[PDB]
Symmetry: C3
Subunit: 455 residues, 3 copies
């Protein structure tokens, strides 16, 4: 057989698993071992977006699940526990396992139980693991996937950083950024029409203050999975190139590519060398996923600029939108205050401030000044103040034709923004009204609901 390094030697090893985006250290071992893996399924509510809860089903309490790292030829004794608070039964299929279901029929586990099975890791590579419990699509859609690395016997070449990034498509009853606890939507899942496409199980999981880091001159290896369930990732790094891309345990290694297709259920190891400082964006280049459904992660490189290689500036809200900023915690706070019935004007203003970035600032500027004759001002805007109800209709339904703002004529087009939720329009407009010497007061989600219902 391949990976035939004889029976386990040394002492049994209790595998150290890591939560995303971190990876366990290299096994750093010259002999095959008995590796004991203990993984516990937890079902739990987490925020899939600010003020949006979802009941995830997880391996080890995270999406993706805990990272497993073994050596080709190891004997893996796999213990799957299902937490007693679980409502569903669960199991595991590991890609790279030689045997039926990749472990599925020997890991079937009711709430409060444990199952175990043993496999030899014959196949070197990076592999997806996921739940394989009927209905399989529902279990995977809820977050039940992760990566197992089977190292080659000599180990992978040393790098400065190893990170763990996994794409998933998600199906909520509600629309993108519609607030509240969102049920799984089986109709959207069967139709392959996700409301969110994410890295590491949430909007902003790898942006702002949760960006991945490295320094100019350092090597980064990223273990990249695609849990699906349904989508194929046009996986891409903005502003850089992959030194290498290797799929699963394939003999083929592609070098010097920027855009690579990762199948649903697929995985790849990519290598990046940091050359110049700034934010390097990992996306699904099926662009509405990256820029309208959440599929953007950041590798932030710190170090000296090299003007001979790139003379230009770090990214801002023009490219990264409301994910340029460290976090949108103000949106979470305002959503919680709406639920409690304690929502203040200032709660709305700080939420609107976070949401205004990119969404409105690309044309009206971060300071609401616009560009005289080209983009009208929101700062001290006579037009805004004259009719707050018209302002709600402009965000929902757009505006075109000649207008006069602060003594100047505009003859341009503001596209409609009907995909903004009622709370988002209300918070953005309350921010604008309470900024730049505008008249203050507030716009409520309920105000916007009535305007949406009759344009």
């Amino acid at each position: 057989l391949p990976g035939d390094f004889g029976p386990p030697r040394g002492e049994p090893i209790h595998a150290v698993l890591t939560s995303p985006p971190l990876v366990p250290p290299p096994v750093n071992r010259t002999y095959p071992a008995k590796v004991i893996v203990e993984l516990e399924v937890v079902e739990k509510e987490m925020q899939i977006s600010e003020g949006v809860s979802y009941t995830f089903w997880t391996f080890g309490g995270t999406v993706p699940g805990s990272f497993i790292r073994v050596r080709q030829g190891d004997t893996v004794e796999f213990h799957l526990k299902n937490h007693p608070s679980s409502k569903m039964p669960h199991n595991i299929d590991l890609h790279g396992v030689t045997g039926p279901g990749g472990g599925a029929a020997s890991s079937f586990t009711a709430p409060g139980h444990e199952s175990q099975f043993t496999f030899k890791a014959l196949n070197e590579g990076i592999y997806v693991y996921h739940c394989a419990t009927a209905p399989v699509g529902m279990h995977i859609a809820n977050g039940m996937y992760g990566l197992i690395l089977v190292e080659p016997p000599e180990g992978l070449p040393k790098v400065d950083h190893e990170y763990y990034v996994m794409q998933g498509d998600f199906y909520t009853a509600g629309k993108y950024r519609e607030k509240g606890l969102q049920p799984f939507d089986m109709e959207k899942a069967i139709d392959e029409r996700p409301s969110y496409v994410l890295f590491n199980g949430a909007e902003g999981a790898l942006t702002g203050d949760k960006a991945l880091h490295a320094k100019v001159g350092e090597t980064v290896r990223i273990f990249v999975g695609n849990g699906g369930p349904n989508l194929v990732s046009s996986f891409h790094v903005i502003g850089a190139i992959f030194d290498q891309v290797r799929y699963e345990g394939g003999t083929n290694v592609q070098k010097n590519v920027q855009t690579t297709l990762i199948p649903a259920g697929g995985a790849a190891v990519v290598k990046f060398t940091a050359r110049v400082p700034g934010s390097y964006v990992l996306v699904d280049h099926s662009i509405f996923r990256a820029f309208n459904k959440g599929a953007m992660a950041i590798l932030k490189i710190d170090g000296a600029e090299n003007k001979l290689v790139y003379s230009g500036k770090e990214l801002d809200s023009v490219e990264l939108g409301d994910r340029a900023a460290p976090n949108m915690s103000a949106v979470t706070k305002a959503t919680q205050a709406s639920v409690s019935g304690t929502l203040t004007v200032q709660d709305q203003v700080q939420a609107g401030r976070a949401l205004f970035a990119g969404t409105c600032s690309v044309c009206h500027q971060g300071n609401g000044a616009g560009l005289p004759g080209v983009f009208p001002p929101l700062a001290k805007s006579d037009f805004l103040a004259a009719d707050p109800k018209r302002a709600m209709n402009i965000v929902l339904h757009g505006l075109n034709g000649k207008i006069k703002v602060n003594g100047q004529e505009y003859d341009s087009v503001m596209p409609p923004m009907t995909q903004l939720n009622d709370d988002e329009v209300a918070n953005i407009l309350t921010y604008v009204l309470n900024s730049w010497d505008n008249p203050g007061g507030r716009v409520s989600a309920e105000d916007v609901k009535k305007v949406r219902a009759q344009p």
Copy 2:
């Protein structure tokens, strides 16, 4: 030119074509030949699913069409007949043909006619062939695709088994498993929203008693096509690895991968070595296709277990659902009896038995016992017997909150199952009522239609 082995020699050869999932024997020849291919288009109703008929358009009476096997450098004299019962005209485009339309403009054939054209097979490889008659998408969607192998002059390396598997997406007016003769749906086809995604033209075409077979230690080569028309396959083998994947006649060979993307209209040769016994599942790992639309095929390996490689069990209904069992012939029978107006309680019970597997058994068990305090029993269930109408609402619309069943409290969640058709809910519940000392009687499709219409 490539494949320049001079003029045909020896005797003209009448090509032996095979129906899926079988392949013609290796050409086993050292000289180029004149190969005469005779292929006849037949339009005909076949079962796309149990009790679901569809009018397929076929090359040779099967989906995919008859497998053609020639040698690089052969002169192929291609005869396309259109059966006189056909309503549409048809033609053929073979990938790997050097010339306009791959044969399309010289193979255009009205019902009851024959066309012929000659081509030299310059290009070694595995290639899709399909109909290229306006509207091309409708002809391909109805089943008009297959494979032609152009062998290299020295032939392919010998293996124990060669099989023929081809994925297709299908567009019915009705929903998945909605019974009756289903028309082609052009709106779903243009939208790329298939109701079925299949191997070899039907649900269960390669599962249960129609699984592919091999023995521990044997090599299997699978000629894998993707007829589309629209989908890209994340083609994957559960519990195993491909020794090799080679696309069309590409110089590139990928080795040691589990998950590979097959383009719409693409084809690949994969090689598998059987290591341990059990069912190895070929899927489109765009998981709702594999587990909700029919895209699952089985390679069943018989032979000695190796507990050093895999300690675990063969797959069952937890993973393969209602395709674990040899066949669902009882569903076909019950559908026929509904049409005839002769549907008996026992017809419903045997259909419901087949459908209960995985769909209900994953939580309630194959024997309806459930798991005390975790999954309530369907066996001798006081709760079921108290209100059969409530049971219909529970399958369609789900159940949550505290209930008491056979003296025990449950506080859990049964997801809704509204994608089940009225006949499916009726048959499953009639099976349950007539099992495990439950009260008997029956639930009709019409009973379920009324409950669906007002939750």
Copy 3:
């Protein structure tokens, strides 16, 4: 660093950019240079289909944008101008640029402004460039993408022809071929449900009198991009094979393939050797894109037939439909005449003539003769003349069952063609009525609207 050929030498070079489908000449240079690129964003209405206008956003006035050609190790001084008639701000992200946003944060440009940034071209290859202005998906969907080639220092091998072909998916408020100025549809874009999938920004951009050309024996290199925003191309050449496919600046080169997957935002260089004359069709083999949404381009090879390689005929309307003919200018004319209120019977007849090809001729023949007993005649048809209103219902809703036409019984099936627009049915039927000794008169779009509204 890679591409470390020292500082720029010689004179600064003003890059010569080309409009699709042409490519600038090889740089033909042994030293690294300072290359000045000047690219101007223009927003403008163009015909996305005959009689269908769309407001495109373009780099250099075309979709795809102007082709840029530099050498690995060049210092590129990039000048982006935004035309003063623009309503939106714009920027550029070039794949293959080493630095944040690929130029995005240093190229942000309001209407009537200019931005500049400098980069070293470290990475050899073919690369997509696109707008990266919030909302990024809307800018790319409107046409803001093109290719930059970074040549290897020794240059690419010489070929007879170099062409520029770029796929895009497009989202109109109206359905496919619905006439008038079509707004961008954000709902369809987010759902990844394009109304058009095109090469070079229009239906027929590379068909008929706009086909690419070469001669038997000549080599063709095609720089193939996929601007997306959302779709992955099953990129395929009908009737031929690619000698080579190379993605971006990848070390991997695939040889001898017919079907290759291009990611959203991806690019590839393909090489084709012309062997036999005729039309070679470039498609997205996700077949409803190629044959129902516009994703078909033609490489027309002129030269001597070789009956030893391919005995068959050039393509016609059976395969290429209404794109076999040089152009459909008559449809543009009839649409303009409807807007003006000057629409004549002859305007309708010539538009219907263009649309009848393939759509109706595949079964009824180019001369309306049909095939006695199999396809009924439209030529001198007693059945057509007896009830023009029934003829409208037959095109929209199909026809089956026994009929008698010109003394012969037919018992067959004409599929419904409800995806035809009201003007298309009206023009086709007016063409038929004014041909082949039929009674004349006309059918109006308004006649068809009333029949569609009550079958």
